[PDB]
Paper text:
For this, we produced recombinant Fab fragments of JoJ48C11 by adding human constant CH1 and Ckappa domains to the respective variable regions of the initial JoJ48C11 scFv fragment and crystallized the purified protein to collect diffraction data. The resulting structure was refined to 3.0 Å resolution. Not surprisingly, backbone atoms can easily be superposed onto other Fab structures, and even several structures with almost identical CL, CH and VL domains including their CDRs can be found. However, with respect to previously published Fab fragments, the VH domain of JoJ48C11 Fab is slightly different, especially in the CDR3 region. To further refine insight into the JoJ48C11 Fab/SCH interaction, we used SwissDock to generate models of a complex with the repeating unit (RU) of SCH and the apo structure of JoJ48C11 Fab. Two similar docking poses positioning the RU inside the typical antigen binding area of antibodies were identified. Subsequent mutagenesis studies proved His35H, Trp47H, Trp100H and Trp90L to be necessary for binding SCH, since their respective alanine mutants showed significant decrease of binding strength with EC50 values of 1.1 nM to 10.9 nM, which are higher than 0.6 nM (3 times the EC50 value of wild type JoJ48C11 scFv-Fc). Interestingly, in order to avoid clashes with SCH, Trp100H has to adopt a different sidechain rotamer than is observed the apo structure. Here, we discovered via protein crystallography and in silico docking that the paratope structure of JoJ48C11 consists of two cavity-shaped binding sites that are connected by a shallow groove.
Here, we have determined the crystal structure of the antigen binding fragment (Fab) of anti-SCH antibody JoJ48C11, both in the apo form and in complex with the oligosaccharide laminarihexaose. The JoJ48C11 Fab fragment adopts the expected heterodimeric structure of a heavy chain fragment and a light chain both consisting of a constant (C) and a variable (V) immunoglobulin (Ig) domain. The Ig domains show the typical immunoglobulin fold characterized by two anti-parallel β-sheets packed against each other. The model is consistent with experimental data and validates our previous hypothesis about the specificity of JoJ48C11 towards SCH and other similar β-(1,6)-branched β-(1,3)-D-glucans, namely that the β-(1,6)-bound D-glucose residues in conjunction with the triple-helical structure constitute the binding epitope for the antibody JoJ48C11.
Author numbering:
A (entry chain A): 1 to 131, 138 to 217
B (entry chain B): 1 to 210
The structure:
């Protein structure tokens, strides 16, 4: 019943500002403080601050005092955090969560922030051609920023699929592979197509893989 | 400003085993809280006030500790308990979290199926060559992949990526990508992917000729 719908992922330029939202449903917005926590890979979780949506009172971790600004709109049951003077250190996942008082064990799904001066770039998609079990796949190369979405035969091919985590190239652009394992007898019969979807560049590409 | 150090950083456990992870606070702490995070989801409250379980948490979990050492325990490890566990304190503000303890599943060794892929002609048109080597459904994660071009051991021109542990059979997969320029690719003829792993008695080599 309780759902915390956070804003979509954002890409921001260095020194710019970004505002992310956190919509509350299923519980009384004013009765619970809204905390904000930061997750960088490798570092762990950092506590940013809280707001009391009834009174608007805020406290901040001294680390984030000047970075973050917390606001809340009782009318829409929505909490806000604004990051300013963005650096690459501010690239992280920011969670929104009523940790106090107790009784709402759920967090928001998380907004991913990327701080880069670079423009978006769509992926190039190359096949990994096969040739009683043959492997085949798709190489999704040279995109920015994250993430990329790979599905197979529009969705009807879920079993045996391995979409690997993105790996950062020396070019500064991400790359990943998506692989599927299938019987080799069905190679000439079944047609295998991977559906690559890169949202920040509004790019959809479908690539047929054949021996 | 209390720094929570969780030990161990990585651990594995067989289903049935008892699991214990600690959280050591740089200063005294009244209560410790524990959150659970599974891959690609947000954290969830798991234990509050040191010992008290959250709503939904199975009884196999339990929490103890005082002063500078707190503990999270699972009496009978289960498959669904594989996740990352963070400890937290409010006692002294600012609130601080732990670095996490990752709980993976144990399993018998499994050898990888190895595949090698030559670069597509569409890619060579772009002037670059990616040679991909795929290791499928193996355990443990520790595997050594080496590229050898005309018996020359490559170095510094390849990247690996590893999947999360499979929820079903607890195996891993890995893709090593050997990136060359189209010029360098065509200088040499034989491309080889040499996998070493405990599930193999001897290293498996997949190769092709240009």
């Amino acid at each position: 019943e309780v759902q915390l719908q956070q804003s979509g992922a954002e890409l921001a330029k260095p020194g710019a500002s970004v505002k992310m939202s956190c919509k509350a449903s299923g519980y009384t917005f004013t009765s619970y403080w809204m905390h904000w926590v930061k997750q960088r890979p490798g570092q762990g979780l950092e506590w940013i601050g809280y707001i009391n949506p009834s009174t608007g009172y805020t406290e901040y971790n001294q680390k984030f005092k000047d970075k973050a600004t917390l606001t809340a709109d009782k009318s829409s049951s929505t909490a806000y955090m604004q990051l300013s003077s963005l650096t690459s250190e501010d690239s992280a996942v920011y969670y929104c969560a009523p940790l106090w008082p107790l009784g709402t064990d759920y967090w928001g799904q998380g907004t991913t922030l990327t701080v880069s001066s670079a423009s978006t770039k769509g992926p190039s998609v190359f096949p990994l051609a096969p040739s009683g079990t043959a492997a085949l796949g798709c190489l999704v190369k040279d995109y920015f920023p994250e993430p990329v979405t790979v599905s197979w035969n529009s969705g009807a091919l879920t079993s045996g699929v391995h979409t690997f985590p993105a790996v950062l190239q020396s070019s500064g652009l991400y790359s990943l592979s998506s692989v599927v394992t299938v019987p080799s007898s069905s190679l000439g019969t079944q047609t295998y197509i991977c559906n690559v979807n890169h949202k920040p560049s509004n790019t959809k590409v479908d690539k047929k893989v054949e021996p | 400003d209390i720094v929570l150090t969780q030990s161990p950083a990585i651990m594995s456990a067989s289903p049935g085993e008892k699991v214990t992870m600690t959280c050591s606070a740089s200063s005294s702490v009244s209560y410790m809280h524990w959150y659970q995070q599974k891959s690609g989801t947000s954290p969830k409250r798991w234990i509050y006030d040191t010992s008290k379980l959250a709503s939904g948490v199975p009884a196999r979990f339990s929490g103890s500790g005082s002063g500078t050492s707190y503990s999270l325990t699972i009496s009978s490890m289960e498959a669904e308990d594989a996740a990352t566990y963070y400890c937290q304190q409010w006692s002294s503000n600012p609130p601080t979290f732990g670095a996490g303890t990752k709980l993976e599943l144990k399993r018998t060794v499994a050898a990888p199926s190895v595949f090698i892929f030559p670069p597509s002609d569409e890619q060579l048109k772009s002037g670059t060559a990616s040679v991909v080597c795929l290791l499928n459904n193996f355990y443990p994660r520790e595997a050594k992949v080496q590229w050898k071009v005309d018996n020359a051991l490559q170095s510094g021109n390849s990247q690996e990526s590893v999947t999360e542990q499979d929820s079903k059979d607890s195996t891993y997969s890995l893709s090593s990508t050997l990136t060359l320029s189209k010029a360098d690719y065509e200088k040499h003829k034989v491309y080889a992917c040499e996998v070493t792993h405990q599930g193999l008695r001897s290293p498996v080599t997949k190769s092709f000729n240009r």
